[PDB]
Structures are given as structure tokens and as C-alpha cells.
Design a protein around this ligand. Structure first.
Ligand SMILES: CCCCCCCC/C=C/CCCCCCCC(=O)O[C@H](COC(=O)CCCCCCCCCCCCCCC)COP(=O)(O)OC[C@@H](O)CO
Ligand SMILES: *[C@@H]1O[C@H](CO)[C@@H](O)[C@H](O)[C@H]1NC(C)=O
Ligand SMILES: *[C@@H]1O[C@H](CO)[C@@H](O)[C@H](O)[C@H]1NC(C)=O
Lengths: 455, 784, 92, 92
């Protein structure tokens, strides 16, 4: 099943799409691309620019084949999320030289009023329910599914005219907070849709933060014989899961009411729970293909495929975790000679001590992480968030770090932090684990050999 | 017309309530373990005062029976209970048992005692003098027997038979149930042979604390349809009628549910109830402006104090023994130390992580300021004539180019002359940082240069300010003095002033520094940012650029009772307490004890706490002074803010260091588990060998660093074959830039030596020691 | 056992990052990338931006269980075997 | 013994990648490149391109047998010598 779902090289599909849209410079004279956007004028140059070049390919109003294989489904859609003027309080002694400040993005401080030349949907607020949208959880914050949206055209000239009209009557002012661009392609050669979403965040403090998402999906599954084979395998997997559930329930109900001091029964229930969640997600997702049917009967409208991509990502994560745990479960059966039994005995005997020391090790690790976050968290770009500090220290263990950046943030306490971290991490904490493991292995082997040879 | 209103907040989160609740739950988690240990100590077992005087009276005839006796006697922080003992005689008729046990009856020399036997049948006519005790270790009793006779099993009163009055019956209970029913101060005063389990009491106490917090949070976040419960009359400052009036009401209304569980299933019910209480408190905590969280904390503290002193005091109106006593005393000491440390940790966490929302915004603000000011272009200038074009093309459009985050104050340029015009080295090879430094000029100069006609020069010295200076340049330390140029207010006049300075040789002659720096405000996140741009000039044609953007939050001392103020005063009190304790110990328990570790860590902690508190207070005062100076008038006055940012950074660093020390000490105290005490022991048992190994490693690293820089200095373009491959450089700059010209600072040497020590596996030698030690300690706790 | 765990991690990384990173685009590529991770010559920016959750988790868990639990077991086995062999030969 | 095994791998690398990679052009280049690999300075791009099979095999086997077995044998000797010296000193 995992080989079937992880199909042949679809890496090149998303690679070509990304390199077409992300790595292309915004203009023949500029050197900036989407990945390195700097300001709002750069965004405007990209919109009427590399985006239009990569979207419409020339070959009554013929359709667009992006690589002469990828078919552009419907039209792309652009959307904007902005806050309102007056959602922001300033000190009364400063209300003489400054008049306008805009709060950070929040559902309570959103703007829901017409602005500019109020003619169409680009200057009128449309609710999330009316847009069939949902949250996104971007980088700065989690954005709603509503805003001011515009549906582009099928040809390049009309889309360029629409973008020029949007730019002339200023559409991205200081009140804007997020911008989304969405579209999809088919690529009929293989059977694999692709959904593209580009997001640009305008934080209150200033700047531009870009992000992208290219996701391949399969919604017409049953086409070839391998598809029927995969369906049969999925049904067999469902039968296996049902059998495991029945066995687990029967073998916990008849006796063994404790059932949890084994670690080979908790793993089974974890695997069962994850697999049942995956089955439920797949069942709920595969039946919601009504958007495809709605689009196929009218191919001049934006197709909504974001929910399917989100659920596909969730299903992929769940399946990966489930297969990892199923592979881990193999340790229960590798006991077939005196050599492999004593290693398992050593691991099981040293697990308690390893956990006991790992508690202290993680406490010290988090002390280092919090100190680094509080000291370097505003200047280094690698300690800006707590989890980023944890990952940075884990990379420091590997030696994948730049010492130049940490010392120039603080001449003192900079070298001290790195020096003490490396010393106390490689000279003390790394050796106690070895001491414990070696002592446990030595005692296990010694007692086993002495009781076996004196019997 | 009150009902209830749903807060319905944004996605923001308030960390004060969450931190307080987490601390209050983890402290109970530790309480449960300690109290369970003490309970199992006193579960089955344990169910000077005694001297060598005649404690038996065998002259009586038929004056005894098989029963038990007891003696109730209280005193100054001393009490007792009942007694039960027997031997082979099984308490025969008129048995004279001159013996005493190791009872906890450590009473004083007071004339208050009540001795009562057990009415084994009818009323006994026994006439025994007393259990006489005169002096064994401390002489806590008196050698006098009253031989008073009471009724059947009646408590015969005496000093060191029909008295039934409130002056004796009820006043006797003023010391009996005084601290047993006072549930707060009763976890270490539980009389034995009772069904309390010492875990129900702690569960009820945490129930009370959690419900106090929840009620106060609900009142401050939901019931606010009367006086906006914010700003109008409920100011953050203590008004004495809004902070305590809510705590008392919350305690009164929460007693009815607390009294419902008193003396099974109560444990789970209390667990789920405190879970829902903390959940609702966290949910309502989001709608909390920063000025009302301190009020909520004060209300909670006042409610706890009132419950501890207001209602519970009136609630009552409705061989092997020495080691056991030492162990229980140690447990009590550990318990109170745990409480004090938990309070200290909560105070430190509030001091450091009080404002965690601005920490994420400050980084983005400073990054945006750097990227919008063309930091790379400014940092790459080397000639003293491109600064004016850079200002013309970058800085001026940034100040008067109306956009987000207004400047809030005009910029300024400050120069030092040095009066010692330097002869520059011919261009080409670099010079070692800077050289040929003299003194700083102070005289005045008119338009152009030195030319006084009537009075003082047009370009006055503008003497340095008392507070806020010492930028700490690349190879020099400056102040806040120097000739200043206002740069103008409007864009048009700024161009004229810049041209006037360029044409009149304002900088070309000496050119020591420029000091371009104004300010910047961001009201969306409420953060200020001090921007400093400096051109340090070692010699003519040699330029060193420095850019520093420091974001901070302007918290003023005049704002009232801010959270930093409360944390600072609490830290000062804690530092005073620790200093007094350590000074008392150092003065009483001998002298000259600084020879060993343990008398240094406490002093370090005291110094760190005092430094944190004083730095925070100084930052608040400096911010208040600077704001008061700036507000009085802003036509063109500069009123820099660099000192406030530096003080804020120092305070944050000190708080982080204190929290680090507290977390390390918390990790240290994990040894109290039976099987987890070995690890730290080995770490303190292998210290000399580790110190010898690290001395050898220091010598080897110094040798390598000497070897690894005497041949990378030979950079040119080809070092060697073996020395190029078998060489280690610490992480960063994988492809070596070579040629350490005036950049072989101390830090890179330590970096490269320490990293080379690891790669070659020299640090793994520590295992060779540690393993052996771990094999010895673990064998000394199995057989013996 | 070491290679069982290695292959489990490689399969997890192939399923998670198999379409975006290009260092996990193939199973053998996943194995080679995992071997290179020990050497500490990876990016971690592309793999963190490919999956904000379950991406860093994989990296941190792999590093912890690979430097702290697995290398020390090899060295413990070697140490014990060497000590036993030396003692046996000395007694001989 | 370690140098014998090191020379075996160096000769294998010279005979396989000695004409495309430019890091194995001569024998001393192979030796120095392997030493640099031990200190974590791998490239793995030219190695992969020059030979899709027997290229990754060499790298994986070298890393496994160098960072898990061979370099873990010096520490066993040092540990046993330390244990014997300490025991002798304590007994005497
Ligand atoms: C010239 C006179 C004195 C010169 C002195 C200069 C010596 C320069 C520093 C040496 C280190 C100190 C002794 C360390 C040896 C004891 C500890 C040890 O060897 O560690 C093991 C092997 O490591 C290694 O690389 C081992 C590299 C070689 C070091 C072993 C000693 C070789 C000595 C052969 C002849 C000596 C007698 C002749 C001298 C006259 C495991 O490591 P680790 O898991 O952490 O892997 C991490 C991975 O990134 C590095 O491969
Ligand atoms: C923004 O709102 C303020 C009042 O808060 C008003 O003075 C200003 O004119 C507004 N800006 C506009 C109209 O763009
Ligand atoms: C949302 O979906 C409905 C179909 O259920 C469709 O009629 C409507 O046009 C969609 N919304 C937009 C903005 O197109």
C-alpha cells in the first residue's frame, strides 16, 4: 500500500512547477524571485510578471498548457486579508504627529467595509461561509477563509488588465495583512492533479514573508489495473485491522485486566488507533469529491481543492507514523539465539536507568534552550522561537552551526554559552549514558554466563 | 441587569495565569510525593521530659487494672497525645511500672498537665503520686507530685474531680484542635491514630487555591458590566476597595463548596473540579490587559491571606527512635525549603517571562528596520565621502518619507574632533585595527573652523549628559559629548543643511566619528527601537561602520505598580532573606568557612538577585526620566534612548541567568529518588580525575591552537599538503577564508581548540573515568 | 537491530519528504542522507520548511537515538569483549 | 591495523573514483580525502555521479566501519589499561 501511494517519480512534477514559479526572477532586469521578496512593490512586480509568464502559455480563447502537458483548470483566484483603521490605541500625548496605526491581524480587528471604488468582489467583504474557505495557519498567525477576492481570466491579456486595474486603484495599502494566490493543474499524461497556493504575509512591524505549497492529489483513482490491485490491498488491510481489533478486545476482556505493563500491548493499541484514524480519514475524504463533479460541469470557475490537499497531507502523516510503528513492532520476533536474547535483555534492563538520567539531561537541555532564547532570541534569526532554539542546539551537537553569528550578537556570554554547552555536552552528559549502558550490559552478560555455565 | 457576558477574545494568550497555575500544580505534584513518603513512614508505626525520678507507685493495694493511660500536656509550641504500652505483668493490680518511652511529649516546664487512666470496669480508687520526672537532659518538668484523685478515667489535673466549666473545658481545646482543624497549617501537625492520610488535607488546600484563582479570574474577566472593571475606577494601583473586596467575596462564596468535602471518591471529584477550574481560568485569562493581571495576582494573594487568617482561625469555634525523629525533621525542612523555592521560582518566572508577546515582535521589528535601512550598503562603506550620498539616497527618504512606524523625534549627528589630526598610512595593506590616538578636543568653533570673533563658536561642544553614554566603539570608549548637528526637521531644509556641512568642511579635517542615531516607534506592537549608526575612523581613508538596532518597551516608573516593580521588590526581599540566612550561618557555625564550595554559591545567588532587581529598577527610573525630559517639548530636542535599551538588555540577561541557575538547582534535587541518587554522586566523586583530564586537555588544546595558527597565518594561497588536510576549524566557514588579518581574537582560538579537541575523540576519554566510577558506586549500594 | 531501526527511519523519511526535499526523493537516497546526517553536512532548512511538524520531530528523535543510545552500545560491546578476552588470555 | 584497513579503502577509492572526481586523482589525494571524511568533510555529489553503484556502497561501508567499529577500539584499550592500573594501585 505504501509503495502504491508513494508512486513513481512525481518529485519531478512538483520540482518543475516550483522552479517555474519560485526560482524565476520577477523581471528581466531584477534579480529577486518569489522566495526573496522584500517589499510590496516587489510583490506587484511579481504579480504582473513571472506569475503571468508561468501561468499562460501560448500554443476561440484556447486553454493554457503550462509545459504542453499540464492543463490549467479553470481560472486562478487572488485574495486579500486586511485589518481596519482604528483597531489601534496610541498614547494621548502622542496623538499630535501620528494619526494612523493598524493592529496586528486578528478576527476581532478585521475590516469588513467597502473601500476604494466599490464595484465588485475585490472591494466588498465576503464571508468565509460564502467563499467555501477555511483557516490556513500561516507563519505569523492563523488566517481566516474570508477576505476580498478576485477571480482572474483564462487569457493573459484579460488577467493583465485586471491586475493593472487593481494596482492603479491602490489595492494593497498599509492596512493589508495577507495575500493568497490559488490555482490547479491536471497533467493528463499521468493521473495526478496538482494544487498550488502562494501566500504573502505583511506583518505589522513591516516587511514581507512569502510561503508556497505545491500538493499532488489523485481523485480519479480507478483507471488502470494497478488501481484495482491497490483497492483490493486496501480492503485486505481493512480486514486485517478488523481482525486485530477483535483480537485485542477479546484478549483484554477475557482476562489480563492490567494489560499495560508489557509495552508490547500498548504498541498494538497505538497502531490500531492510528490505523483506524487513517481509515476514517480516507473514508471521509474519498466520499467528498463533489467539488470535482461541480467543476467538471462548468469549467470557467475556480475549483476548490484546498480541503482535499489538507486531508491528503494529514493522511500522509498518519500513514507514515503508522508504518514506522509497524516496522518498529518487528523487535518482538527477533529472538532466535542466545546472542539476540541477551541484547534485548540488556536494553530492557537499562531502559529504566536511561529514562532516569534522560529526565535530568532534558532538564539541563531546556535550561540551555531558555537561556539562549532569552539572550540571543532577538538578533540571531536562529533563536527567535523556543523550538528553533531546541533545533539549533541539536544541530550544534552535529556541528552544523555558524559560530560567527552567535559571537557577534554578544561579545561576552556568546563564546561562554557555546564553550560550556559543547564541553558539558560532549565531556559529561554523553559519557554517563555510556557508563550506564556498559554497566548494564556487563552485569547482564556476566550473570547470564555464570548461571548458564554453572548449571 | 448583570447576568453573564462571554469574553470572546482574540487568539492572543496571557502567560501569567498559565505560569501561576502550572507552578501551583507542580508544587502539589512534589507535595504528594513528599507527603506520601512521610505517611508511609508513619503509616503502620508511630501509633528530656522523662527523667530518673520515681514514676511508679506500688504502695497501693488493689489500685490498678489492665488498661491504658495517657497524659495531656501542652506548652510553648509543644503538645502530646495518648500512650499505650504493656509488658509481661499485663498491668496487674497496683502495678508499679517505673519506665518511660520515646514519646513526642517535648513539653516545657509549665504547670499544665492532665493524667487520665482508662476506666477498666468500675471507678478505680487508685491514689498514685505522679509519673515524677526532675532532670534527665533539659529539666523540662518539676519534681513535685500532687497525687490528685479524679473520677473513673477522668483527667486528673495538675502542675509540672468536678470541674466542668467553659473556663476549663473549652479553653483546654484552644490548644487541642487549634492547629489540627486549621487545614492550611496542619500538613505537618497531624496527630496520629486519625483518618486523615495527610493527602486529603493537601488536596483540599490545592482545591482552595485553584478555586480562589478561578473565582478571581472569572470576576475580573466576565463580571464587568457595572464599572468596566478596568481603568475607570479599578486602577492597577491598590485602591483598598477593589483588590481586597473581590478576594474576600470570592473566599466567602467558595467556602460552601470547600466545606462539602471534609472530615474515597473525593480525590477524583477534586481532580476533575480543579481541572475544570484551571481550564476556565485559562480560557478567561486571554481577555486580560497587562494592567489588570497584577490586580488579579494581588486579589488572589489577599484572598489567600484572608482565608489563612480570617476564617480558618474562627473555624475552630464551630535505639531507633532518634533516627526516625531526625528523618521526620529532615522531611519537614525539605518541605518548607520546597515551598520557599517554589515561590522564588514563580517570582523569577514572572520577572523573566512576564512579557513573552513582545519578544517575538521585537525580532521582526529589528529585522525590518535593518532591511529597510540598507544595512549591507552602510556596513560596506570604506571611504569618508560616500556617507553623504548614502544619507542622501537612503536615510533622508526613510525619515521624511511618511510610512509605518513614525520616527518620534528628529535625528542628530554628533562628532568628536580629537584635535590631533592624523597622518594616514599609504593605502594598501591593513593596519592593526587602530593606532595613533591622542586626546579629545573640547574647544568651540564658529562656521568653518577655529575662529571666535565675538563669543562662543557656532559649533559648540554640547557637553555630555550625566546618564547615557559609552557606546564602546571598536577600539575606543566614547561618551555623550561632541559637536552636534540637528539635521533639520523638514526634507527641504535637511538638504540645505547637508549641503552646508559638505561645503564648509565639517568632517574632512579630523573625521573621528559621526554618530547618526535617532529613534523609532511602533505602536502596533507598542515597542520602541534605538538605532545607532557609527563610523569609527582609525585613519584617513580607513572606515569602520557599526549598526545597532535595539528594540525595547518603554515601561515608566510613574505608571504605578507595574509587574516589573512587583517582581523587583519581591526579588529584593528574597535576596535580603537569603543574605540574612547565609550571614547568620557563617557567623554562628564557625568562621573562615569560605575555604570550601557551598559558601560561594549562596553569595553568587544573592548577588545575581540583587543585580537583577537593581538593574530593573534603574531601567524603570531612566525610562521615566527620559520620557519626562522629552515630553516637556519636542521642537528639535533629541533626548536619546540608548541607555534604556542597554539597561533592558542587561536586566533580561540577568533574569535569564537567574532562571538558569534555578533550573540547574531543580535538576540537582532529583537525587531523592532511590535509584536515581547514583548519577550525581559519581559526578561529585570523579571530580579530581576529571579536573586532571581537563587540565591535560587544556594543555593539548593550547598546543594545537599554537600549531594551527602559526601555519594558517602562512595563508598566502597554499599552506601545505598534510597541514591542509589534517587540520580542524570549528563550525562555520567550511571553506577557510585564511589570512587572519587583525582578526585573531580570543574567541575564535577557543572555538577552534575546543572543536578540534572533540573531533579527535579527546573528550571521550572522560567516559574512561566515569564508567569506572559508575561501576564502583553501584556496587557499594547492593551488597552493603 | 541497528539496521532495522535505520530502515524504519528511512521509510518514514521517504514517506514524509519524498516529494519536496530531493535528498529523500528515493529510498536509497534516504539511506545515504541518513548516513550523511551523522557527518553533520545537511541543511535542515528545506526539511523544516517542507514539514513544520513531524519534520523537526524526525530530525531531533533520530539524532538523539543515534548519538546517545546506539553508538554507546557498540562501544560497550567492544569494551566488554576486549576486557573478557584480555582476562582470559592473561589467565591462560 | 587501522592503517592497513585505511590503505585498503584508499586503494579501492583510487581505483574507482580516480579519474572523474578530482579528489581521488592521485593516491595521496585519496588518503587526504579519506582523512578529511573522518573529520566530517564529505561532498558525496561527485562520488554519487561518478558511480551510482559501488560509489554509495564505498561511502556507507567506510562510514559504518570507521565511526562504529574501528575508531571504538582505541578507547577499549585505554579503558582496560586504566582499569588495570587503578586496580593495581589500589591493591598495592
Ligand atoms: C606524537 C606524540 C603525541 C602526539 C599527540 C597528538 C594527538 C592528537 C590528539 C589525540 C586525542 C587524544 C587521544 C584520544 C584517543 C582516545 C579516545 C579515542 O580514540 O576516541 C575514539 C577514536 O577517536 C579517534 O578519532 C582516534 C584518532 C586517533 C587517536 C588515538 C591514538 C593514536 C595514537 C597512535 C600512536 C600513539 C603512540 C605513539 C606515540 C609516540 C572514539 O572517538 P569518537 O567516538 O568520539 O569519534 C568522533 C569522530 O568525530 C572522530 O572520529
Ligand atoms: C484613519 O482613521 C483616523 C482616525 O482614527 C482618521 O483620522 C484618518 O483620516 C483615517 N485615515 C484614512 C481616512 O485613510
Ligand atoms: C461555494 O460553493 C457553492 C456550491 O456549494 C457555489 O455555488 C459558490 O459559488 C461557491 N462560492 C464561491 C465564492 O464561488
Amino acid at each position: 500500500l505504501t509503495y502504491g501511494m508513494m508512486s513513481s517519480n512525481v518529485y519531478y512534477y512538483t520540482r518543475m512547477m516550483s522552479q517555474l514559479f519560485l526560482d524565476t526572477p520577477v523581471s528581466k532586469t531584477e534579480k529577486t524571485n518569489f522566495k526573496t521578496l522584500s517589499s510590496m512593490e516587489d510583490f506587484w512586480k511579481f504579480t504582473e510578471g513571472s506569475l503571468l509568464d508561468g501561468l499562460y502559455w501560448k500554443m476561440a480563447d484556447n486553454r493554457s498548457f503550462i509545459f504542453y502537458e499540464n492543463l490549467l483548470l479553470g481560472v486562478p483566484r487572488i485574495r486579500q486579508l486586511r485589518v481596519r483603521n482604528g483597531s489601534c490605541s496610541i498614547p494621548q500625548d502622542l496623538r499630535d504627529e501620528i494619526k494612523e496605526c493598524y493592529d496586528v491581524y486578528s478576527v476581532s480587528s478585521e475590516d469588513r467595509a467597502p473601500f476604494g471604488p466599490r464595484n465588485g468582489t475585490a472591494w466588498i467583504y465576503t464571508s468565509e461561509k460564502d467563499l467555501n474557505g477555511s483557516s490556513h495557519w500561516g507563519i505569523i498567525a492563523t488566517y481566516s477563509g474570508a477576505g476580498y477576492y478576485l477571480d482572474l481570466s483564462r487569457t493573459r491579456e484579460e488577467t493583465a488588465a485586471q491586475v493593472a486595474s487593481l494596482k492603479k486603484n491602490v489595492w494593497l495599502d498599509r492596512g493589508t495583512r495577507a495575500t493568497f494566490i490559488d490555482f490547479s493543474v491536471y497533467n493528463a499524461n499521468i493521473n495526478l492533479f496538482c494544487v498550488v497556493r502562494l501566500l504573502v504575509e505583511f506583518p505589522a512591524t513591516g516587511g514581507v514573508i512569502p510561503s508556497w505549497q505545491f500538493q499532488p492529489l489523485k481523485l480519479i483513482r480507478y483507471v488502470t489495473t494497478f488501481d484495482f490491485f491497490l483497492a483490493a490491498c486496501e480492503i485486505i488491510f481493512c480486514f486485517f485491522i478488523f481482525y486485530y481489533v477483535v483480537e485485542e478486545i477479546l484478549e483484554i476482556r477475557i482476562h489480563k485486566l492490567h494489560y499495560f505493563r508489557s509495552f508490547w500491548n500498548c504498541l498494538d493499541v497505538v497502531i490500531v488507533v492510528l490505523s483506524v484514524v487513517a481509515i476514517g480519514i480516507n473514508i471521509y475524504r474519498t466520499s467528498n469529491v463533489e467539488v470535482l463533479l461541480q467543476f467538471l460541469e462548468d469549467q470557467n470557475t475556480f475549483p476548490n481543492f484546498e480541503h482535499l490537499a489538507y486531508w491528503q497531507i494529514q493522511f500522509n502523516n498518519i500513514a507514515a507514523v503508522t508504518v514506522f510503528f509497524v516496522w518498529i513492532k518487528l523487535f518482538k520476533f527477533i529472538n532466535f539465539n542466545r546472542t539476540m536474547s541477551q541484547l534485548s535483555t540488556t536494553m530492557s534492563r537499562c531502559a529504566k536507568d536511561l529514562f532516569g538520567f534522560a529526565i535530568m539531561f532534558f532538564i539541563i537541555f531546556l535550561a540551555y534552550a531558555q537561556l539562549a532564547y532569552l539572550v540571543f532570541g532577538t538578533q540571531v534569526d536562529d533563536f527567535s522561537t523556543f523550538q528553533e532554539c531546541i533545533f539549533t542546539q541539536f544541530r550544534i551537537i552535529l556541528g552544523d552551526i555558524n559560530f560567527a553569528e552567535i559571537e557577534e550578537a554578544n561579545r561576552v556570554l556568546g563564546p561562554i554559552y557555546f564553550t560550556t554547552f559543547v564541553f558539558f555536552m560532549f565531556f559529561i552528559l554523553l559519557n554517563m549514558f555510556l557508563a550506564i549502558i556498559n554497566d548494564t550490559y556487563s552485569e547482564v552478560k556476566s550473570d547470564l554466563a555464570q548461571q548458564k555455565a554453572e548449571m | 441587569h448583570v447576568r453573564f457576558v462571554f469574553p470572546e477574545p482574540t487568539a492572543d494568550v496571557n502567560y501569567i495565569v498559565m505560569l501561576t497555575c502550572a507552578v501551583c500544580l507542580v508544587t502539589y505534584m512534589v507535595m504528594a510525593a513528599i507527603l506520601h513518603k512521610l505517611d508511609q513512614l508513619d503509616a503502620s508505626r508511630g501509633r528530656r521530659f522523662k527523667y530518673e525520678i520515681l514514676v511508679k507507685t506500688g504502695w497501693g493495694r488493689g489500685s490498678g487494672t489492665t488498661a491504658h493511660v495517657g497524659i495531656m500536656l501542652y506548652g510553648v509550641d509543644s503538645r502530646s497525645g495518648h500512650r499505650h504500652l504493656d509488658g509481661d505483668r499485663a498491668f496487674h493490680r497496683n502495678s508499679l511500672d517505673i519506665f518511660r518511652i520515646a514519646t513526642p511529649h517535648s513539653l516545657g516546664s509549665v504547670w499544665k498537665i492532665r493524667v487520665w487512666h482508662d476506666n477498666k470496669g468500675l471507678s478505680p480508687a487508685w491514689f498514685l503520686q505522679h509519673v515524677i520526672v526532675r532532670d534527665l537532659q533539659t529539666a523540662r518538668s518539676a519534681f513535685f507530685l500532687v497525687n490528685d484523685w479524679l473520677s473513673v478515667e477522668t483527667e486528673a489535673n495538675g502542675g509540672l474531680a468536678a470541674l466542668l466549666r467553659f473556663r476549663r473545658l473549652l479553653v483546654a481545646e484552644l490548644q487541642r484542635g487549634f492547629f489540627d482543624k486549621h487545614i492550611w497549617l496542619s500538613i505537618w501537625d497531624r496527630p496520629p491514630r486519625s483518618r486523615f492520610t495527610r493527602i486529603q488535607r493537601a488536596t483540599c488546600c490545592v482545591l482552595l487555591i485553584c478555586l480562589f484563582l478561578g473565582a478571581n479570574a472569572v470576576w475580573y474577566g466576565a463580571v464587568g458590566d457595572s464599572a468596566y472593571s478596568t481603568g475607570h475606577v479599578s486602577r492597577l494601583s491598590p485602591l483598598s476597595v477593589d483588590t481586597v473586596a473581590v478576594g474576600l467575596v470570592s473566599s466567602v462564596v467558595v467556602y460552601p463548596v470547600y466545606l462539602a468535602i471534609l472530615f474515597s471518591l473525593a480525590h477524583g471529584l477534586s481532580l476533575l473540579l480543579v481541572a475544570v477550574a484551571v481550564a476556565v481560568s485559562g480560557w478567561v485569562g486571554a481577555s486580560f490587559p497587562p494592567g489588570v493581571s497584577v490586580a488579579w495576582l494581588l486579589s488572589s494573594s489577599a484572598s489567600f491571606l484572608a482565608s489563612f487568617l480570617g476564617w480558618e482561625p474562627l473555624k475552630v469555634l464551630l535505639f531507633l527512635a532518634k533516627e526516625e525523629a531526625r528523618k521526620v525533621k529532615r522531611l519537614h525542612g525539605m518541605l518548607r525549603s520546597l515551598l520557599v523555592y517554589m515561590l522564588f521560582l514563580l517570582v523569577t518566572l514572572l520577572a523573566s517571562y512576564g512579557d513573552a508577546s513582545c519578544h517575538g515582535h521585537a525580532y521582526r521589528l529589528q529585522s525590518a528596520i535593518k532591511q529597510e535601512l540598507h544595512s549591507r550598503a552602510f556596513l560596506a562603506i570604506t571611504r569618508s565621502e560616500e556617507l553623504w550620498p548614502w544619507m542622501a539616497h537612503v536615510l533622508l527618504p526613510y525619515v521624511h518619507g511618511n510610512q509605518s512606524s513614525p520616527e518620534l523625534g528628529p535625528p542628530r549627528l554628533r562628532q568628536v574632533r580629537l584635535q590631533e589630526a592624523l597622518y594616514p598610512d599609504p593605502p594598501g595593506p591593513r593596519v592593526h585595527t587602530c593606532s595613533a590616538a591622542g586626546g579629545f578636543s573640547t574647544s568651540d568653533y564658529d562656521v568653518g573652523w577655529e575662529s571666535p570673533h565675538n563669543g562662543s563658536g557656532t559649533w559648540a561642544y554640547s557637553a555630555p549628559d550625566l546618564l547615557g553614554a559609552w557606546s564602546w566603539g571598536s577600539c575606543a570608549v566614547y561618551d555623550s559629548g561632541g559637536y552636534v548637528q540637528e539635521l533639520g526637521l523638514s526634507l527641504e531644509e535637511s538638504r540645505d543643511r547637508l549641503r552646508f556641512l559638505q561645503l564648509h568642511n565639517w568632517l574632512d579635517n579630523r573625521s573621528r566619528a559621526v554618530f547618526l542615531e535617532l529613534t523609532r516607534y511602533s505602536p502596533a506592537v507598542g515597542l520602541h527601537a534605538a538605532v545607532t549608526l557609527r563610523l569609527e575612523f582609525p585613519a584617513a581613508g580607513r572606515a569602520l561602520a557599526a549598526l545597532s538596532v535595539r528594540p525595547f518597551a518603554l515601561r515608566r516608573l510613574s505608571a504605578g505598580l507595574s509587574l516589573p516593580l512587583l517582581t523587583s521588590v519581591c526579588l529584593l526581599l528574597f535576596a535580603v532573606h537569603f543574605a540574612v540566612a547565609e550571614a547568620r550561618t557563617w557567623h554562628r557555625e564557625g568562621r573562615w568557612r569560605v575555604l570550601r564550595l557551598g559558601a560561594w554559591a549562596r553569595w553568587l545567588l544573592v548577588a545575581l538577585t540583587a543585580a537583577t532587581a537593581l538593574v530593573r529598577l534603574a531601567q524603570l527610573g531612566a525610562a521615566d526620566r527620559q520620557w519626562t525630559r522629552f515630553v516637556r517639548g519636542r521642537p528639535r530636542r533629541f533626548t536619546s534612548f540608548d541607555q534604556v535599551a542597554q539597561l533592558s538588555s542587561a536586566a533580561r540577561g540577568l533574569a535569564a541567568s537567574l532562571l538558569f541557575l534555578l533550573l540547574v538547582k531543580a535538576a540537582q534535587q532529583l537525587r531523592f529518588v532511590r535509584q536515581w541518587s547514583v548519577f550525581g554522586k559519581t559526578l561529585c566523586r570523579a571530580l579530581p580525575e576529571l579536573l586532571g583530564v581537563t587540565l591535560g586537555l587544556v594543555v593539548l588544546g593550547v598546543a594545537y591552537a599554537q600549531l594551527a595558527i602559526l601555519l594558517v597565518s602562512s595563508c598566502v594561497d597554499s599552506l601545505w599538503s598534510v597541514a591542509q588536510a589534517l587540520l580542524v576549524l570549528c563550525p562555520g566557514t567550511g571553506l577557510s577564508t585564511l589570512c587572519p588579518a587583525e582578526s585573531w581574537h580570543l574567541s575564535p582560538l577557543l572555538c577552534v581548540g575546543l572543536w578540534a579537541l572533540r573531533l579527535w575523540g579527546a573528550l571521550r576519554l572522560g567516559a574512561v573515568i566515569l564508567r569506572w566510577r559508575y561501576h564502583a558506586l553501584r556496587g557499594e549500594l547492593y551488597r552493603p
